[model samples]
Target: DVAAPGAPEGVTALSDAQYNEANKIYFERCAGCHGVLRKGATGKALTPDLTRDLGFDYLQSFITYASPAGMPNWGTSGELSAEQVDLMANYLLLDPAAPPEFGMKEMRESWKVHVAPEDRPTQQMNDWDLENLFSVTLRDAGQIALIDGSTYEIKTVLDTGYAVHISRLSASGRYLFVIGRDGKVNMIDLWMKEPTTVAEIKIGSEARSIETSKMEGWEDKYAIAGAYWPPQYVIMDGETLEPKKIQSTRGMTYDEQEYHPEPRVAAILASHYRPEFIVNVKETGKILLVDYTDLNNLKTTEISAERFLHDGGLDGSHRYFITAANARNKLVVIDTKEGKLVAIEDTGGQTPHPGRGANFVHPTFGPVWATSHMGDDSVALIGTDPEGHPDNAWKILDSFPALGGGSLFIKTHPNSQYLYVDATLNPEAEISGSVAVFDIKAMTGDGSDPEFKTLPIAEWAGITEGQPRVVQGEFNKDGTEVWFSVWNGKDQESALVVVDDKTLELKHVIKDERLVTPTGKFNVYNTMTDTY
Candidate 1:
């Protein structure tokens, strides 16, 4: 008998015969993208490959709701009955090996769907102790690298989604999660000798960032998320790798940042129910702070843009939250504990505008910023609490004109002392492709001025885009060096720039044209392979 909470009464539980029939439907309707063996396909490989993805429960919740963004409306579409989805959920966990009944290749060939490189070799990056690395190349075929200790080898390549790139590895480094342009989250087991998919969760369209966190009592079990799209956040039952629930703001207005401000596009710092906050910029320039601690029950409070843009500090605490108005050239601070608007401060930078990237800092100093369309020589630096709240106002320690306009994204050093700003050299202006660095802590402390220094990419690197943007850049944990990826021009070739994190000088440039072109449709968000 069906025992799941929502199951209909008097319904017979799935028997072996019923399971066999359900598997047939899965192989016919789902397996094409999910894989005949349920390993994984161009869609999302949701199989019991624990080493590759999460367990099963998290996956079922999502399939049932057909959440939002790219996932099909299974319920309304009448694609499958509730019972069938349940059986499919059980199938992902029980049956590991199954034969294909249809020719998916032929079916896919019959249609004109853009499938990026999906079949890539699974790299053996880790031994049994650590996880492996599965990646997608932006060329004719993608590559999967197996990283074992210090050594790595390529495993295979296949036609897959263009945007098939692994953004973040799990806290344990055992699960490798990849996001696709079509809004599917693929899970790979790094611990498996031959990495296969464990589960697939329907997240959202243009999914950008993914973060994994564990509950306080459930340390062995955890949750993963795919943000930066609609339907906001997908919460998984970490161990099962299934979609357990989705969290979002109700009746909340989104600041489209010109396009649409994605409520799902929030930043997650460390693991452990860690304080991760969400920023909602309204059309009126008002910002809201949403705490993820109680995912199912969201709690929100408005923050003062002035307090954060002005003088604010941890006071003695480790966390704070702030909102930067790239257009108005202002920042607001919010004290999360009391749900109070702390202070508002001006970045003291002239305003043609602000940056458009992930701006703000976790107490741990993972500072990120996005300059606005307005050409403002301003970069705001603010700190947050563990709960991802603005504890203090953003004190402008450094401001420089060179770091103005379309400053795509800025990443701060883990030590919270160094800040990096990516600015597109105004075509009419003298500045070209550039990045600026500032001593964040010192600047915030004694009101020391921001020491502006530029990476040599402006002089050495050749960029084609009229307004070339340095999208995503980050420093390794040691804080000795930094790496970033940038879009060049229409030619589609991208470049990887590495520099000395401390000196703010160019170190190396992998001028591979293929790297410049994004493998998938989602080029706005870049991936960070290493950390600082």
Candidate 2:
């Protein structure tokens, strides 16, 4: 019989079964923040030297009752049982298990073109309102449900990769590109009478981000998916989802200038003005805008930003790609036009996690962007306009205290006067199950105190059974309605609570039997236009 992989030199207590179980659990839950090799990214490294000294009991307790450092209480939150916690504690002291390498041959084998591009429809193939459609990721179900925003009805539920991390839209607004944590990418053609998966491909064992070519003349001609494990990205033919090229992300980190083994890709966005992609390498803190004109000789201008650069947003001008180096307490901005570094503005907060952050023309601060801190108790607003508001540009103009634990996502719309944020990662149930709102209209010309308040989603949505983590705040096509996902609610009826953008009142709670851990929801109009 074939032999199992060897464990640590000193640790022989863990059996093969226990080791395998723990590795699967860690890859599914913890590996995204912590590196695959137990190296650190956003989360601190799980060092065997330090952890073995702390022992199994200590690790178990920490896993059961997490801290406010954005570590979710997996055990107490019912995500992990006592037995599973024990498995992880015992496994932590052992050496990290390296998954099998997935390369060009494996990627080509996984590629499947369900519908040939030549045979694809030439005109509008469906009668649905393409603008108001919503693509919601069903994490555990390995699927995505396309819901009708106009009717709040489940239009179609299609199979996708497991734990779909993000749903991206093609430039033409007819194709929905989705990538799962499993490194599987699927292109769904919404033009079908009923939206269906047209093409699919797997990049690696793990992944987080995917983007497509959306330049003036190169709309939906190519696609790119970034791998979290092997630290590589794949460029594919956008039409057939065929594997074209694979580029590894192993390089030198900006801060240390040392060899980095786990430089994973975090955020990816297609440049609207140029035929290139803004690929953010997490551990290395380098932004590579890869030109798609020549896939064979890809022209990439590497610009060094800050370390631990995760998710970011485009400014009002759509020229500056501003994302957070939360660990460094700075906002890393990249000028797509200049193809160079712009500014690293100080956020003055701990772990400022902005999910594509909220952008609007601030009444007083001119054009501005807002970010929510995961390790601090405040939301920081930054001035993004340099030409219009030079005095307040590129700095945290003002800060608002949001004490219901730190936030995971912040969202606003051009048509709405208010902005919303959520605290889904906090351990405390009462706080994690709530959403905070800010009154942008209340900020005076003199930049006085801004109005702020917290809303208990469990109470407002009337869920009696379990405390649910209310996640992302996604606005409808018209920005008149804001939908909060009560996905992990203990109640059987997990729901999407819709609120009126103008009046701040409950409009509807679209509860469905199919929502079994919904997280990120993307609207067609906003996603196609790159409006966050």
Candidate 3:
């Protein structure tokens, strides 16, 4: 008789050693596309039922030869061996282990307090100009390159976890916290001459967002990280990576009232007015306003919102927290001060992914927050100011037309006159590799006649079919220059293209063979000050 899915017949059970090795390989090569839990993201999910239906032989063949959209053919890349492929194929068929619960005891045990608060530097020790530094994510290389914004030179490449997702700065602008998809958090002390990783810790199997406590009197006192695997968030020491407390987000849903097994954390941001962290639970459609004033006695205010809450950020005033309920096709607004749901505006678009939303004053709508869609060819501009402009509050003023959708990030600087959106997820190569620039001043004539133009990254770089996939766009300290990454996929050389904010012209293409698969570029000063 045949066995059930994920339960193979006549196959030897994998040892602990074999399983660890296979997991390491999976994290390095496969986890980015196929999620850490073998659920899908950009690549298809390697679930037990799917693999069982496909069989080991067919799965092996597909892994060796297939080149799906946004995924590279690993067989030709020489990254994995034949035996490793076989091991992965078989590993997918086995039952996955339950993620470990990170209690306060477990967190304290994993904590490694390297530099004490008293021993740390009180001011800038060196003349490296802390404000103008750029923490560029060298995605495939499993490292981060701190480039000098003034000279565009690589200051230092520090080794971090596999595929470091985002580099966040401390509130004091003295320390940088870099988190990887593999759940390893590295605390880089900027006061050092070379800026070394002072402390590190593994919170879980997978994670995304990490932020420092930015509220008054709580500056650089504590830090928090949201985990994807265990469905929890961990609070640690700000200067050191010492885990203080762990809080699991597993609970009943907001609307459905059903138990959600894995309600992964999608995004997290530190509130300015309040000493709280806005934690977005992806599956359960819940928003947790975690208070950090007293970590020993932690307090969380649950604000019900739309389902599948994804990336979001604070508005212009830093009072209202706006996040995307992508699955429900709406944007949920939460009043952080009141700790209640403000409003939910139907975006009339699909899969809104706003990476720290672009807050700018519109010509007709007044102060509006902008977000781009992943499933539609439009950018929705929603009115945010309720007190001043009550007529436009909680309403979408305009859904501006774009060349295509699949926009992962939309950025604008307080000093800049234009708004930028990247359509990297579009199926068409031209649109996927291009960015749309909108003139803020030109958004005057009836909101419908806004001026916008699309510029292909390949055209700017003069690389034909090189697939100059543009990702995050960040501004310099003074907001004079905008830097965007030209992600050339895995196993290919990538470059960081710098553009003049005033003219929106390509100023320079900072390319190096060492900077392989560059994705998100976060400027130190802008990120720390919350310019976006």
Candidate 4:
């Protein structure tokens, strides 16, 4: 077993302040799933608690081995600097609950989703608010539409990998980070009048997801967390856009029972204290907390062991992390501060893809929120109880009485509080369509069950269903509107579904069938393009 390095000889006396800081640092770095007290919650507890029977020496040996059971080697990954590792080891093994320098405090307030009181049409929308607003429509044919607010002129940026585009804008709104199935992070600069390719990073295989967050200590720099890929995470000097490998996963040994995790999704929380990312490793349901506070002395540790865990979206106190497991059929709630399992409530199977999608829930309050794809028969709702228990239970809170079909994706309006549910209808019948509006705020009430209102996409303005094939939909940062790409199965035509945010309705359908296929693709952003 590897020693924590820094235990001064005959130094049996440790200061209380030093011990408290050690515990605080350990909680900040290791407790997320190791249990706030290291007693264990989503992850196997470190101490001899009811949840786990492991000992300090067992843990020490496990850290060295990093078995398929779920432990990682902190000494090797540059996860813990020599001093920090000593502090953490003493805190975790010797003194578990030395109080924090500052007690656990609330992080941030959760955003509420609400429906706008007034309805505004797509064309009649104000010029002032729409000027800087640009819309991107991801088309299957490897084309992306850049819409000009003033003239409504469209400039298309076509790339071979765009056939399966997954992208996000940097916090600064300067660069667009696009990752394709081919495992490449394409850096696109939108600061210029036209979209320009700044640079690209080729992150090898199993690179399922990507995220960019502002590093705490480093001003104007962002850390890039790659999922389902080796060397699981890398810090991209946000300003220079340089990549530095930060964390890596060691192959699990045969004897140990640690989770052999394949990192998949990432989310950043506690921006005030320091930028810590909650990384989800697929299948094993493991999450690792990567601290970017002191990049030179990076550290990583397991957080939780929730199975089939997918992309997670935060709402301050609670993290509404989505799970792909149909059996659970709900969002996995994690008390980010306490590092404990809050609860798991059912979503009624509306958004059930045991293993897919990057961003799952769009936080909204008041009415019922959901993601639908199969048919308009059902819409999934995001329900919550500010004061709930062991089962921080969440019900599907379906918009319609009966549920059917499934959704590929969904989003919420930024200003108004409406939740958008996109149901991919009648795939078997060859009917191509989606359902748009659903009142979200109404469904989440002070009581056990709440009622919500729903609207049809066909009845709304911008949506059209015919050749059936949109696989995903997302809203711009403003949340004023959203663009959806249609798929028509394999080797066929598709279109883009442009919808208005406030009304929870469709605005226009840009039918460029050649750009879409009847059957959707796996990875479309960096490989196939118009040039192909």
In TM-score terms, which candidate is top?
Answer: 2
Candidates ranked by TM-score: 2, 3, 4, 1
Write candidate 2's Cα lDDT for 206-278 as tens digits: 8999987888898878889998889998899888988888899999998789999888888898887678899
How many residue pairs clash in all the candidates, one count each? Answer: 90, 0, 0, 68
The C-alpha local distance difference test score for the whole of candidate 1 amounts to 0.45
Top candidate when judged by lDDT against the true structure: 2
The residue ranges of model 3 lying beyond 4 angstroms of the native Cα positions read: 1-97, 100-110, 113-115, 445-449
Candidate 1: where is the Cα deviation over 4 Å? 1-166, 194-197, 206-209, 214-232, 252-318, 325-375, 383-398, 414-418, 428-432, 439-451, 458-469, 489-492, 502-506, 511-532
Q: Each candidate's TM vs. the true structure?
A: 0.53, 0.88, 0.86, 0.58
Model 2 accuracy (lDDT, Cα): 0.84
Put down candidate 1 lDDT per residue, 139-223, tens digits, no spaces. Answer: 2323222222112223423333345543455555555555555455656555445666555554554445455543234332444
TM-score-wise, the better of 3 and 4 is: 3
> How many pairs of residues in model 2 come into backbone collision?
0
Question: Is 2 or 3 the stronger prediction by lDDT?
Answer: 2
Better of 1 and 3 by lDDT: 3
Give candidate 4 misplaced runs (Cα > 4 Å): 1-143, 149-152, 158-164, 214-220, 227-231, 250-273, 316-330, 337-340, 346-403, 425-432, 441-466, 471-473, 476-482, 489-491, 501-506, 512-532
Worst 10 residues of 3 by lDDT: 1-10
Report the C-alpha lDDT of model 4 over 399-511, residue by residue, as the tens digit. Answer: 45322365555545335455444445545322235444445445433434334344343333233344554444555444566555565544544555556766545677655
- What lDDT score belongs to each candidate, Candidate 1 first? 0.45, 0.84, 0.82, 0.45
lDDT at position 269, candidate 1: 26
Pairs of colliding residues, candidate 3:
none
